[PDB]
Curated annotation (Swiss-Prot):
Subcellular location per the Swiss-Prot or TrEMBL entry: Nucleus, Nucleoplasm; Cytoplasm; Nucleus, Nucleolus; Nucleus
First and last residues shown, out of full length: 17 to 109 of 491
Subunit-level organization: Interacts with p53/TP53, TP73/p73, RBL5 and RP11. Binds specifically to RNA. Can interact with RB1, E1A-associated protein EP300 and the E2F1 transcription factor. Forms a ternary complex with p53/TP53 and WWOX. Interacts with CDKN2AIP, RFWD3, USP7, PYHIN1, and RBBP6. Interacts with ARRB1 and ARRB2. Interacts with PSMA3. Found in a trimeric complex with MDM2, MDM4 and USP2. Interacts with USP2 (via N-terminus and C-terminus). Interacts with MDM4. Part of a complex with MDM2, DAXX, RASSF1 and USP7. Part of a complex with DAXX, MDM2 and USP7. Interacts directly with DAXX and USP7.
Protein family membership: Belongs to the MDM2/MDM4 family.
Domain SWIB/MDM2: 11-94
Tissue expression per record: Ubiquitous. Isoform Mdm2-A, isoform Mdm2-B, isoform Mdm2-C, isoform Mdm2-D, isoform Mdm2-E, isoform Mdm2-F and isoform Mdm2-G are observed in a range of cancers but absent in normal tissues.
Swiss-Prot/TrEMBL induction comment: By DNA damage.
Name this polypeptide is given: E3 ubiquitin-protein ligase Mdm2
Associated disorder: Seems to be amplified in certain tumors (including soft tissue sarcomas, osteosarcomas and gliomas). A higher frequency of splice variants lacking p53 binding domain sequences was found in late-stage and high-grade ovarian and bladder carcinomas. Four of the splice variants show loss of p53 binding. Lessel-Kubisch syndrome: An autosomal recessive progeroid syndrome characterized by short stature, pinched facial features, prematurely gray hair, scleroderma-like skin changes, small kidneys and consecutive kidney failure, followed by severe arterial hypertension.
Effect of residue 43 to A: No effect on its ability to induce apoptosis
Protein function: E3 ubiquitin-protein ligase that mediates ubiquitination of p53/TP53, leading to its degradation by the proteasome. Inhibits p53/TP53- and p73/TP73-mediated cell cycle arrest and apoptosis by binding its transcriptional activation domain. Also acts as a ubiquitin ligase E3 toward itself and ARRB1. Permits the nuclear export of p53/TP53. Promotes proteasome-dependent ubiquitin-independent degradation of retinoblastoma RB1 protein. Inhibits DAXX-mediated apoptosis by inducing its ubiquitination and degradation. Component of the TRIM28/KAP1-MDM2-p53/TP53 complex involved in stabilizing p53/TP53.
Amino acid sequence: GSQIPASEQETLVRPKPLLLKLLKSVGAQKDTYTMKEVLFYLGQYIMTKRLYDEKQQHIVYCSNDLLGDLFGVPSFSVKEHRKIYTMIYRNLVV
Ligand SMILES: Cc1c(C(=O)O)ccc2c3n(nc12)[C@@H]1[C@H](C3)N(CC2CC2)[C@@]2(C(=O)Nc3cc(Cl)ccc32)[C@H]1c1cccc(Cl)c1F
């Protein structure tokens, strides 16, 4: 479940306030982005907060970070792209 159509990646989206705060924390100071750009910046967020040092396995543990509050989960797999898109879609305006 790691494949996402280009059309979804390239669609413009408006993050809700908590997602916007996470994006601004890594220097993304816009209110409209493509989904791919959101995923780029959230990847940089994960790395900057040291939530993925064990790169030879797939899990991000986020129960002690605002990312866990945003996604509503204690952990997730980086390979499960569809599940991640669903969790981000719950944090977009309409
Ligand atoms: C597909 C695949 C496999 C595999 O094939 O076994 C194995 C590892 C993978 C990894 N990603 N894809 C992987 C990448 C990357 C590690 N990760 C960052 C992490 C390093 C810090 C990403 C990333 O770049 N941005 C990001 C943002 C969030 Cl919120 C959550 C996970 C990631 C992932 C990813 C990229 C494109 C769209 C999606 Cl939806 C997505 F989740």
